[PDB]
Amino acid sequence: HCRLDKSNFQQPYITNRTFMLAKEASLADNNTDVRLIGEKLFHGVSMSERCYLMKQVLNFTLEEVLFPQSDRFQPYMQEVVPFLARLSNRLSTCHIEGDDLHIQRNVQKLKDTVKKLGESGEIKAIGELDLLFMSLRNACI
Template sequence: MMKRVVELVVKDVLLTEVKNQYPYVDQVAQFLASLTSELSGCQFSGKRDNIEKNLEQVKNKMEQLGENGKTKAIGELDLLFDYMENACTDAPKKGGSKKKN
């Protein structure tokens, strides 16, 4: 799932015309692209149908919002990074919301 979210952010947000508005978008996009290749070895866990449906809803909502949707997605990259950090480490950072087993 994270791979799909990262691909969505890179392809549909960062590598569009909004990249001209932010000075470091190319570096962030390159980092996320390399992260996508790292995530390719991960095993999928969860209900694929629900995740695909949710990703499609996110994509549709971004398209409806146009440039505002892309700007919002960029503004929420910190949430994506926090989620990824919590999913990949033992302890949550910065008050993240890692689920307890």
């Protein structure tokens, strides 16, 4: 069962940090065509499965994007990662009954895009932490 308490998204300090990190990383992004978290990602996914979908994206973002580039974007990274990780932890006892193929297919497209763009693909992801934060909030509360 996937739900996150809204209180997680209402603290001024950490919210500001997460958004400044997104700004920082985006001021170093060049792709003006591809948006990782957008309409295509949620396409064909019911409201009730969106939090589960976001769980995948968050896991990927911590694992293959944030944990890597830790030596960068200081001192934002140092505060934001623990926070996102706490959230990813809460969502581990969260699953869905049905078929998650269409969902995994959507996430796959995002994972592909990041790996293909390599180094900067990770930069783009971090530049989108503001959309990640908004998506987690809307899908999980």
